[PDB]
């Protein structure tokens, strides 16, 4: 499937152009030409102030997932478009689940462990105490098919099918 290497067609032409105008506001005046702006790398601090990210519980993590920089320390305009495409209401549930999973996998090991799931739950929530353990045990009980103690992507889709609340995280996070 290789979502990252797909050319996503979720944004309209106007959205693309408007995104470019907003991206250019983060650049020095001299880098705002079309050609200069598409070579630019914008550090996360400027991206993190945007309305799409400022109050996002996983904002630092979202920056890292969409950055195509090998240092994972900035977004190009194209990374920013990728971001807005996945965030759009038009983005398909399969694309959103893919990227939500990546976001929630903090160590990028390919699974959601007890810590990964804890942050997810906190994001929905006066937080839970050590009743967080109770909750996580029941998710694994239902959806940890290979019984490895973690939740992989397939199992994640099961959880999403089971829980309106976890499914609502897609609107919160993307």
Enumerate binding residues for Ca ion (CB under 5 A): 87, 105, 107, 109, 111, 116, 144, 146, 148, 150
Nearer to Ca ion, 30 or 152 (CB): 152
Bridge partners (DSSP) of residue 75 are 42
Nearer to Ca ion, 32 or 114 (CB): 114
CA 107 to CA 11: how far, in whole Å?
30
19 contact partners, CB below 8 Å, separation of at least 6 = 11, 77, 80, 81, 84
Contact 100, 170 (CB under 8 A): yes
| 116 annotated as ligand-binding | yes
33 contact partners, CB below 8 Å, separation of at least 6 = none
Q: How far is the CB of 29 from Ca ion (least distance, A)?
A: 27
Q: How far is the CB of 68 from Ca ion (least distance, A)?
A: 7
Nearer to Ca ion, 29 or 100 (CB): 100
Q: How far is the CB of 140 from Ca ion (least distance, A)?
A: 8
Contact 77, 66 (CB under 8 A): no
Q: How far is the CB of 149 from Ca ion (least distance, A)?
A: 7
| 78 annotated as ligand-binding | no
Closest by Cα among 29, 27, 28, 33 to 76: 27
Nearer to Ca ion, 66 or 87 (CB): 87
Annotated binding-site residues for Ca(2+) read: 105, 107, 109, 111, 116, 144, 146, 148, 150, 155
């Amino acid at each position: 499937l290789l979502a990252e290497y797909q050319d996503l067609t979720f944004l309209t032409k106007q959205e693309i152009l408007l995104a470019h105008r907003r991206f250019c506001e983060l650049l020095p005046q001299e880098q705002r030409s079309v050609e200069s702006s598409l070579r630019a790398q914008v550090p996360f601090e400027q991206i993190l102030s945007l309305p799409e990210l400022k109050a996002n519980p996983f904002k630092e993590r979202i920056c890292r997932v969409f950055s195509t920089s090998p240092a994972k320390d900035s977004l190009s305009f194209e990374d920013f478009l990728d971001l807005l495409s996945v965030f759009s209401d038009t983005a398909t549930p399969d694309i959103k689940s893919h990227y939500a999973f990546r976001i929630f996998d903090f160590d990028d090991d390919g699974t959601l462990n007890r810590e990964d799931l804890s942050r997810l739950v906190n994001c929905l929530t006066r937080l839970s105490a050590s009743e967080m353990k109770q909750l996580i045990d029941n998710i694994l009980e239902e959806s940890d098919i290979d019984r490895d103690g973690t939740i992989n992507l397939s199992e994640f889709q099961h959880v999403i099918s089971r829980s309106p609340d976890f499914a609502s995280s897609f609107k919160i996070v993307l």
